[PDB]
């Protein structure tokens, strides 16, 4: 990787999220989104390291602080859509063509820390919040499918979640140090997803009833000893990080225990490896994997970019010294984008 370009956003506020759109064709434009302050900005990656600003969405609320964004497509037309949320706990669905807000979802009793679209069903949006719960939305019928939390749910703010390869289960983590598994391929959850597609507030006067999932399918507080701010699946394995300067690769149960044969009572975990690094002991630092899950990338609090081949390397520039909050690889992994606390964007090409 070589640094081929760099730019700073005029608002000067930290950039907390960055996502390439992976739903674009080959030979179609390479687009990425950035979130920070009350803004969502679109960019196009061109030949010889050029970054072209497409458009920005500025939210009406000046005190809204976007923390996350995620890309989806309209199943019927294949046109891209972008979901954004943050400190207001409002989900906004933006039309990237016109950078206009199509619709919004209110529900969470505090800020939204991460947004994730279901890997198979583009209408299924997962939100994680400071209110201790996860929420699964059907953005086609504008319904709240399920609320994950309560009694045996997270006991503090949820910082991250990720679906497995096929979107049969979610793993979430937060300030309570725990990592919780929630199966969505249960009869109850599949009937709720099916039911949510048949709902229309125009054909009934009764509300749609959300599944209230009070108990996870697995839980552990044995991986990390501090806030768990990032979680991602690597097949049936889990990669998670705290602020203890390591990304831990682990799994529920014992060495030969199948994740789908694990009972909720399961008290064992198996650590399969660690990715050690330095100066990334501040809360809110995300790691990211490329489309193929062939590469791992994590930025540190002083502008260093760690990149590991999953089949280490440090990417530095003297002008890059602020905390790198999030990174994103293009679908083909040829480009890696890093976003910083000083509103700066850094482009690294293979
Ligand atoms: C410059 S400062 O004033 O010290 C500061 C620093 C961090 C935050 C902040 C960032 N991010 C989120 N949530 C999203 C999130 C969650 C997990 C990992 C992760 C992210 C974004 C990057 O890595 N926050 C929720 N509440 N505060 C925050 C706000 C102010
Ligand atoms: Ca399985």
From Swiss-Prot:
Outcome following mutation: residue 284 to A: Abolishes binding to H3K27me3
- UniProt region (Interaction with EZH2), positions on chain: 1-350
What's an example GO BP annotation here? regulation of adaxial/abaxial pattern formation
Entry GO CC: chromatin silencing complex; cytosol; ESC/E(Z) complex; nucleoplasm; nucleus; pronucleus; sex chromatin
Q: Which residues form a coiled coil?
A: none
Q: Where is this region: Required for interaction with the matrix protein MA of HIV-1?
A: 68-222, 220-350
N6,N6-dimethyllysine found at:
116, 187, 203
Posttranslational modification: Methylated. Binding to histone H1 'Lys-26' promotes mono-, di-, and trimethylation of internal lysines.
Explain the induction of this protein. Expression is induced by E2F1, E2F2 and E2F3.
The record's WD repeats, renumbered to this chain, cover 10-53, 61-104, 107-147, 153-194, 223-260, 278-311, 319-350
- Keywords of this entry: Acetylation, Chromatin regulator, Chromosome, Disease variant, Host-virus interaction, Methylation, Nucleus, Phosphoprotein, Repeat, Repressor, Transcription, Transcription regulation, WD repeat
The GO terms describing molecular function are: chromatin binding; enzyme activator activity; identical protein binding; methylated histone binding; transcription corepressor binding
Summarize the impact of residue 221 to S: In COGIS; decreased trimethylation of 'Lys-27' of histone H3
Compartment list? Nucleus; Chromosome
| Statement: the UniProt record of this protein carries the keyword Cell inner membrane | no
> Which tissues carry this protein?
Expressed in brain, colon, heart, kidney, liver, lung, muscle, ovary, peripheral blood leukocytes, pancreas, placenta, prostate, spleen, small intestine, testis, thymus and uterus. Appears to be overexpressed in breast and colon cancer.
- Signal peptide (residue range): none
UniProt superkingdom: Eukaryota
Return the similarity comment.
Belongs to the WD repeat ESC family.
Q: What is the documented function of this protein?
A: Polycomb group (PcG) protein. Component of the PRC2/EED-EZH2 complex, which methylates 'Lys-9' and 'Lys-27' of histone H3, leading to transcriptional repression of the affected target gene. Also recognizes 'Lys-26' trimethylated histone H1 with the effect of inhibiting PRC2 complex methyltransferase activity on nucleosomal histone H3 'Lys-27', whereas H3 'Lys-27' recognition has the opposite effect, enabling the propagation of this repressive mark. The PRC2/EED-EZH2 complex may also serve as a recruiting platform for DNA methyltransferases, thereby linking two epigenetic repression systems.
**Clinical disorder:** Cohen-Gibson syndrome: An autosomal dominant overgrowth disorder characterized by accelerated osseous maturation, advanced bone age, skeletal abnormalities including flaring of the metaphyses of the long bones, large hands with long fingers and camptodactyly, scoliosis, cervical spine anomalies, dysmorphic facial features, and variable intellectual disability.
Record remark: domains: The WD repeat domain mediates recognition of trimethylated histone peptides at the consensus sequence Ala-Arg-Lys-Ser. This is achieved through an aromatic cage encircling the methyllysine, and involving Phe-16, Tyr-67 and Tyr-284.
Query: What protein name does the entry list?
Result: Polycomb protein EED
Q: What is the lineage of its organism?
A: Eukaryota, Metazoa, Chordata, Craniata, Vertebrata
Give me the gene this protein comes from.
Answer: EED
Question: Which residues of the parent chain are present?
Answer: 82 to 439 of 441
